[PDB]
Ligand binder design. Structure first.
Ligand SMILES: Nc1ncnc2c1ncn2[C@@H]1O[C@H](CSCC[C@H](N)C(=O)O)[C@@H](O)[C@H]1O
Ligand SMILES: Nc1ncnc2c1ncn2[C@@H]1O[C@H](CSCC[C@H](N)C(=O)O)[C@@H](O)[C@H]1O
Ligand SMILES: O=C(/C=C/c1ccc(O)c(O)c1)OCCc1ccccc1
Ligand SMILES: O=C(/C=C\c1ccc(O)c(O)c1)OCCc1ccccc1
Lengths: 256, 256
């Protein structure tokens, strides 16, 4: 049994009270207050549509993924990754795809900097999308479940889906459950073929074991995974530590 | 040894009487009577030239392949796939290629809806046809044999041939024998490069293990192939169910 599996079982036994305290203990998070109010008033400039803009930025600012050229954003939801990439120098085009409808976030239209190179398309199930040519492949799909075996299956499905989109391009792909042995096996194969590394984003909540397979890095997958498991297990054992609050992204205005 | 190989052996040892029962047990089939008679009288409107029009329809109405723009139809034979696509809104041109001559079906001239955008060309061996730039690649080639090794080699040949035609386009390609290990290996490589999924058409007879590699899907090829093998093996025992008969396609009349 994996360290991650022990973590999951412990997480599943928490009360909703214990869970709510745990989920943000010692994490980093952006202050969304300003953005949430502006969006409520239908402002279309400056604000990130979600916590996702800031999350992707953390990777980009550390050169783990360097968005360039034609960017595909699989599971774009409201569009946080898409809008953020649209303001980056090397990026020429952003195409976002998301399922929408009951239970799923719909793309939010914005006029943040570089909006004119973005197209977000709802009603698109990525498992039925043919792969297109692109220079950056982003994917943020993976729905949490109390069952790790369910999560294991969802994770493998994503990994099998993304592979045809990968051809010596930049990438950043969510791995919802990286600790189950079968996933590890797949990731090892994928790293051998396409390189990259798994990385834990500090803006991730303790309530999820998600890690991101980014293109620009090397290292041991198993080691990285166990380190996160250790971290998350330890964060059970301490009274809540309030999250480190950071300024949310300003995504600006106007065409490029 | 694969589940498919076991099915083949069981199939080869059936009597012609047992075969004739088995081949249609529980399948779906269109009623070709009306169409067969009209075509005998030389009528050129409404009728599909083969069972193929209905067969392709099944995929298209489920978004598995979305014919659009320039459509190439490799192994068009009488022209069932070509004439069907010719009436679809997004399709602009249909070019069908088939071998013809002794033993092989010749294109049948028709005036079904959109006939004027179809060009069906006999005396064309697809294996010597330079790859052309198309938006939809269809291919329905693959001759049965009692020997799965023979079928294996025929299948690989087709898969090698189709590959250079595929470039982020829509496609639907027959895989005559998808259960032999070497074919599975090739399909796995192709799916990694080009994506798509293998699918079983219910209008297929139990007498063939053919599956179609369609562009708009993802998933595990081995798993899907074994599911068909299981379905076909079970249909040996489960006592005969007469085929579910449906109405054949009405392909209309006139230019577009
Ligand atoms: N099969 C599928 N195809 C397409 N989108 C899917 C999907 N399954 C889940 N999704 C979507 O994937 C999204 C992941 S959350 C999106 C966060 C985004 N990066 C941002 O910046 O805001 C959800 O909106 C969910 O609806
Ligand atoms: N190497 C080859 N080059 C061209 N056509 C070929 C071929 N091998 C087989 N064929 C043709 O492919 C056809 C397969 S039948 C599939 C045709 C489908 N029912 C339709 O109507 O569109 C046969 O008629 C056969 O003559
Ligand atoms: O069971 C689930 C799973 C869905 C899920 C989770 C995390 C994700 O990143 C994601 O893409 C999908 O729902 C989350 C539970 C929930 C819902 C509303 C309010 C509070 C809590
Ligand atoms: O709420 C969740 C947890 C995951 C998650 C992922 C990403 C997020 O950004 C987030 O806020 C949450 O998903 C539901 C699964 C679950 C619930 C309770 C216990 C165990 C498993």
């Amino acid at each position: 049994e994996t360290l991650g599996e022990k973590w999951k079982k412990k997480l599943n036994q928490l009360s909703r009270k214990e869970f709510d305290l745990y989920k943000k203990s010692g994490i980093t998070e952006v202050d969304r207050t300003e953005a949430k109010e502006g969006l409520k008033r239908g402002e279309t400039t400056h604000h990130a549509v979600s916590r996702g803009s800031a999350k992707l930025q953390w990777f980009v600012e550390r050169n783990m993924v360097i968005p360039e050229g034609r960017v595909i954003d699989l599971g774009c939801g409201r569009g946080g990754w898409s809008y953020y990439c649209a303001g980056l120098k090397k990026v020429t085009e952003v195409r976002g795809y998301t399922k929408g409808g009951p239970g799923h976030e719909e793309p939010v239209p914005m006029s943040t900097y570089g909006w004119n190179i973005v197209k977000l398309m709802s009603g698109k199930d990525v498992f039925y999308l043919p792969p297109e040519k692109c220079d950056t492949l982003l994917c943020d799909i993976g729905e949490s479940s109390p069952s790790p075996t369910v999560e294991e299956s969802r994770t493998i499905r994503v990994l099998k889906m993304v592979e045809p989109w990968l051809k010596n391009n930049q990438f950043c792909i969510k791995v919802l459950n990286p600790y189950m042995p079968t996933v590890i096996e797949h990731l090892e194969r994928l790293q051998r073929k396409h390189g990259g590394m798994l990385v834990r984003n500090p803006l991730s909540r303790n309530s999820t074991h998600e890690m991101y397979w980014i293109s620009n890095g090397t290292g041991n997958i198993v080691s990285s995974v166990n380190m996160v498991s250790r971290l998350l297990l330890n964060r059970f054992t301490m009274t809540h530590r309030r999250p480190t609050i950071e300024k949310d992204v300003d995504l600006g205005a106007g065409t490029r």
